[PDB]
Paper text:
Here, we present a novel polymer-based support and an associated deposition method, with the aim of providing ultralow-background conditions for serial data collection. These proteins included the insulin, thaumatin and HEWL that were used in initial tests, and also TD1, a tubulin–DARPin D1 complex, EcR2a, a class Ia ribo­nucleotide reductase radical-generating subunit, rhodopsin–miniGo and PepTst, a bacterial peptide transporter.
TD1 and EcR2a are both soluble proteins with crystals grown using vapor diffusion, rhodopsin–miniGo is a membrane protein with crystals grown in vapor-diffusion plates and PepTst is a membrane protein where crystals are obtained using LCP methods. However, successful blotting of sponge phase was demonstrated, offering new possibilities for handling and background reduction for sponge-phase samples. Blotting of the sponge phase was successful on the silanized chips; as shown by investigation of the background signal. However, the procedure for sponge-phase blotting still requires substantial improvements and is not yet suitable for crystals that exist in both the cubic and sponge phase, which is a common occurrence in LCP crystallization trials. When a surfactant is present, i.e. for lipid- or detergent-containing crystallization buffers, the wetting on the polymer film is usually sufficient.
Residue numbers in the entry: 5 to 270, 275 to 405, 423 to 478
The structure:
């Protein structure tokens, strides 16, 4: 019967809903760093380029950290379907803010809107995907992979369309197209959802019991009061610069897993098996750090060290989702072909880290051989994104912990990307790439012990 690639027809609605949100997100991130460079060059934004690179990282870290709670707010308060809609509305307004004839004053407002909007929409669209499949249904893994292709499809075409629009009609026009991209998703999601989506998800599936509202309000109130108390203390002692606030969000993002892990210990049944997660989680952190630097460090390398005089330099951001779109058909073949091998999930996380380390190690070669004073070939970045996406495919298959590793890895980037420049290029690439490889080699021994557990 009628399907969307063998799947329920509701997938096409959610497939396009997320493609257009990812089009709006990754089209914005493809030019946002260059937009901050431009505001710096005109004197409107009084920060260094190292700070702007750190802003891009802590931006992504907060976006994925905000996704760790959107599932809770939907499942318990507002509902999954209203969360996606109003989440996209906030995402749309965030891109409209950057389209207004403002400058650096509109950066923080746009960032807050997209952080909150993505937190509402991003996890709940995937939740609504699994609601098309009953728990017995076996097309789940096939349906989510189709869903991933739509994530990367919009992520691939966004820098091409938005980047070219920036170099032709300017930034404000380019950011408006990102808002239009989200608006297109809202139209298809609203009217398309009303036809094929279960109305049971217009409301929370686990609404708060009467006795649960007060302790939750206390819990939220104490967290906001403490976070505000820290900001007050910082301004009293003089720690009030923008890098100081970035350091605060970095500590907060990293303190969440280490506190959620330190007291997860207290039952020897899985007391050691809880520990087995740690090497897999920390490996996921360092990989997402390497992977998310493509929009920061590799975006900086493309703009300064590559002869890209015949196309917009923001198009290099399409290499990350392009290789995924190419690897997916091969990788679908691979996992069902080598059924007898069955690579253990721990072992995969090193190969993903080794590949990520290889991608940076490769990028240390052009500067060591030709120097950093000139321009190199664009195929260095093509070969670099070819290796890191290779590792992403291996690590590709609660999502909040998944959101958390990306947030911690991106929070780690908020500190490291400030070390990158033309004079530190070779050492930065070589040492962070070498250290990531040797930390993939230590996994072999640690995987064996996790295999035993
Ligand atoms: C999506 C971005 C990927 C771009 C990959 C480009 C692969 C290019 C390979 C050849 C090296 C650059 C050649 C420069 C070039 O031919 O310029 C033409 C001439 O006008 C001199 O600038
Ligand atoms: C005006 C600025 C507001 C910006 C809002 C950004 C809020 C981002 C994150 C808040 C939620 C942090 C709590 C995350 C958490 O503990 O969940 C992790 C847990 O689910 C692991 O599975
Ligand atoms: C209008 C205010 C901004 C939009 C409201 C949503 C702000 C995000 C979070 C508010 C706190 C909700 C509680 C989150 C929470 O308890 O997460 C628990 C965690 O275990 C999730 O699994
Ligand atoms: C700047 C935009 C302001 C908001 C304009 C749109 C508000 C107009 C009507 C409210 C529609 C709320 C729909 C919420 C919802 O859950 O939609 C889910 C979708 O699947 C349709 O059921
Ligand atoms: C419980 C709260 C968890 C912490 C979440 C707070 C995250 C809020 C905002 C993060 C925005 C990152 C910094 C944005 C920024 O620096 O841009 C403004 C700057 O351009 C103005 O000069
Ligand atoms: C459909 C509702 C949400 C979609 C966004 C709607 C608004 C999008 C575009 C309207 C025009 C954008 C403004 C373009 C602009 O002002 O920049 C050009 C000019 O300022 C620089 O020379
Ligand atoms: C300055 C540019 C305009 C700024 C405001 C743009 C807001 C325009 C339209 C609101 C979009 C609402 C979401 C789109 C949608 O599908 O809504 C359908 C629903 O509201 C119909 O009941
Ligand atoms: C940072 C500002 C956040 C503003 C919104 C955060 C709200 C967080 C916790 C309070 C949630 C109370 C919702 C009560 C509710 O809707 O359920 C009531 C009913 O189901 C109980 O019988
Ligand atoms: C629940 C216990 C609360 C005790 C305080 C918790 C937070 C402790 C320190 C937060 C420091 C914020 C980031 C450090 C900082 O501001 O560095 C400033 C430096 O970069 C120059 O301004
Ligand atoms: C008893 C709890 C376990 C033991 C405490 C573990 C430490 C807990 C939180 C610290 C978070 C890591 C520090 C954040 C970080 O590495 O960046 C520091 C930097 O941003 C300051 O400028
Ligand atoms: C198969 C893809 C992986 C290829 C990467 C393997 C190459 C490993 C390391 C190459 C970087 C060497 C760094 C050379 C170096 O730093 O020398 C110092 C001086 O020459 C440059 O400042
Ligand atoms: C899983 C498959 C991985 C296969 C990767 C094989 C790549 C082997 C070597 C690549 C090292 C980088 C190439 C260095 C190089 O050719 O520099 C010279 C270049 O300028 C030629 O003009
Ligand atoms: C199988 C992968 C191909 C081989 C990868 C190993 C490449 C190792 C180093 C990168 C090329 C070395 C660049 C020359 C160099 O670093 O020395 C320069 C320095 O001596 C000048 O003072
Ligand atoms: C699985 C893929 C592994 C990637 C293998 C590593 C290859 C990476 C870069 C090769 C650099 C070749 C650059 C030489 C070239 O063709 O362009 C010449 C240059 O002078 C034009 O600008
Ligand atoms: C069947 C899949 C095998 C893929 C693994 C091989 C990786 C793909 C390309 C590696 C290219 C090696 C670098 C080529 C090179 O050294 O530059 C050649 C250049 O000097 C010719 O002008
Ligand atoms: C199990 C949780 C995993 C935690 C992974 C994060 C590792 C903990 C702390 C990393 C701190 C990185 C500090 C970077 C640094 O100090 O150098 C950069 C600095 O100069 C920026 O101004
Ligand atoms: C020699 C250390 C054990 C080798 C383990 C295998 C690691 C994978 C590839 C070798 C990477 C060599 C990196 C060379 C390097 O880091 O040079 C640093 C350079 O800045 C100082 O000249
Ligand atoms: C075990 C968890 C590891 C997670 C954190 C790994 C990195 C931690 C700290 C790195 C900051 C120290 C910077 C060392 C350094 O000199 O690198 C900069 C150099 O490459 C350019 O000058
Ligand atoms: C400068 C030398 C560069 C090349 C060295 C890289 C390869 C050398 C050693 C890698 C494997 C070390 C032994 C790992 C091992 O088999 O331990 C047992 C482990 O498999 C148990 O799970």
């Amino acid at each position: 019967g009628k399907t969307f690639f063998g799947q329920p027809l509701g997938l096409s609605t959610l497939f396009m809903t997320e493609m257009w949100e990812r089009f709006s997100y990754y089209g914005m991130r493809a030019i946002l760093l260059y937009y901050m460079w431009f505001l710096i060059s005109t004197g409107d934004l009084h920060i260094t380029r190292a700070t702007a690179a750190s802003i891009m990282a802590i931006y992504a870290s907060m976006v994925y950290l905000s996704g760790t709670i959107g599932g809770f707010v939907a499942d318990r308060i507002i509902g999954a379907r209203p969360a996606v809609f109003w989440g996209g509305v906030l995402i749309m307004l965030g891109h409209i803010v950057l389209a207004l004839p403002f400058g650096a004053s509109a950066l923080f407002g746009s960032i807050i809107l997209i952080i909150i909007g993505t937190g509402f929409l991003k996890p709940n669209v995937s939740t609504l995907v699994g609601t098309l499949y009953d728990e017995h249904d076996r097309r789940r893994d096939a349906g989510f992979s189709i869903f991933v292709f739509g994530i990367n499809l919009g992520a691939f075409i966004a820098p091409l369309i938005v980047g070219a629009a920036q170099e032709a009609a300017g930034y404000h026009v380019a950011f408006s197209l990102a808002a239009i991209g989200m608006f297109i998703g809202l139209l298809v999601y609203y009217f398309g959802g009303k036809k094929t989506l279960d109305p049971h998800y217009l409301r929370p599936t686990d609404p708060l019991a009467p006795e649960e509202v007060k302790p939750l309000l206390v819990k939220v109130s104490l967290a906001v009061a403490g976070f505000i108390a820290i900001i007050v203390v910082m301004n009293l002692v003089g720690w009030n610069s923008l890098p100081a606030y970035i350091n605060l969000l970095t500590i907060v993002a990293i303190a969440i897993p280490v506190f959620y892990f330190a007291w997860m210990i207290s039952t020897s049944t899985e007391h050691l098996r809880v520990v087995s997660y740690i090497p897999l989680f920390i490996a996921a952190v360092l990989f997402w750090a390497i992977e998310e630097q493509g929009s920061v460090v590799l975006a900086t390398f493309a703009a300064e060290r590559v002869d890209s005089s015949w196309f917009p330099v923001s198009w290099f951001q399409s290499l990350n989702p392009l290789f995924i779109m190419l690897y997916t058909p091969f990788f679908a073949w691979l996992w069902t072909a080598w059924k007898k091998n069955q690579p253990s999930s721990p072992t995969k996380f090193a190969v993903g880290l080794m590949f990520a380390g290889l991608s940076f190690l490769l990028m240390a070669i052009p500067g060591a051989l030709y120097g950093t004073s000139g321009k190199v070939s664009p195929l260095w970045l093509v070969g670099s994104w070819a290796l890191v996406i290779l590792g992403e495919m291996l690590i590709s298959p609660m999502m909040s912990m998944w959101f958390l590793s990306s947030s911690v890895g991106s929070a780690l980037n908020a500190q490291l990307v400030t070390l990158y420049n033309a004079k530190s290029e070779v050492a930065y690439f070589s040492y962070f790439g070498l250290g990531s490889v040797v930390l993939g080699i230590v996994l072999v021994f640690l995987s064996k012990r996790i295999q035993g557990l």
